[PDB]
Amino acid sequence: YKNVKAWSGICVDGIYGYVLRQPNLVLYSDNGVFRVTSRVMFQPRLPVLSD
Amino acid sequence: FVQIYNCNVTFVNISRVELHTVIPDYVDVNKTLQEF
Amino acid sequence: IGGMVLGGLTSAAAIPFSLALQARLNYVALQTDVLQENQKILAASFNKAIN
Ligand SMILES: *[C@@H]1O[C@H](CO)[C@@H](O[C@@H]2O[C@H](CO)[C@@H](O[C@@H]3O[C@H](CO)[C@@H](O)[C@H](O)[C@@H]3O)[C@H](O)[C@H]2NC(C)=O)[C@H](O)[C@H]1NC(C)=O
Ligand SMILES: *[C@@H]1O[C@H](CO)[C@@H](O)[C@H](O)[C@H]1NC(C)=O
Numbered sequence: 001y002k003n004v005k006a007w008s009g010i011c012v013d014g015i016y017g018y019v020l021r022q023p024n025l026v027l028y029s030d031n032g033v034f035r036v037t038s039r040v041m042f043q044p045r046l047p048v049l050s051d
Numbered sequence: 052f053v054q055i056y057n058c059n060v061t062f063v064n065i066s067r068v069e070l071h072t073v074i075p076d077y078v079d080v081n082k083t084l085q086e087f
Numbered sequence: 088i089g090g091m092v093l094g095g096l097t098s099a100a101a102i103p104f105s106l107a108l109q110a111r112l113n114y115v116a117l118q119t120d121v122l123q124e125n126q127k128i129l130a131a132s133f134n135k136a137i138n
Contacts, residue, residue, distance in 0.1 A: 059121035
């Protein structure tokens with residue numbers, strides 16, 4: 001398994017937290033590139049607003 | 052939908068512009084900004 | 088056993104067992120990779136396990 005730099009969410013302008021709708025997903029920093037993965041299997045993809 | 056690169060052959064073959072006829076309310080904002 | 092390959096197609100058309108398994112993987116975690124790197128590994132591993 002990989003070591004993943006997870007974030008609890010994004011807080012835009014210091015006011016608006018946004019978090020992934022689905023609890024089974026991890027938002028993480030791939031050396032500055034934000035990506036989303038399953039908590040079970042490392043199958044990463046880019047985030048969309050609809051997440 | 053979710054975005055995944057790759058295009059593993061057996062996919063609807065379509066341009067970004069034509070996409071709005073497959074997914075209603077899709078907006079190509081970049082093209083739009085170039086026109087407006 | 089035939090139910091493993093008689094995937095949900097018209098007629099009584101079957102699918103490759105490789106596909107059947109891919110579906111059973113997506114069930115667990117939606118797969119984001121077009122190419123099945125995992126299948127040759129798992130087929131080989133499976134074959135050893137059965138032997
Ligand atoms: C959607 O458009 C793509 C891109 O034009 C088409 O996929 C490509 O189709 C050709 C025909 O299906 C593939 O066959 C190739 O033929 C040459 C002989 O002319 C041969 O040397 C190559 O080995 C090969 O088999 C090509 O690989 C393939 N594209 C992909 C991604 O594999 C695809 O046909 C169109 N999609 C659909 C659903 O038809
Ligand atoms: C899309 O618009 C942004 C805003 O005008 C501009 O930075 C970007 O380069 C445009 N992208 C494309 C692909 O034309």
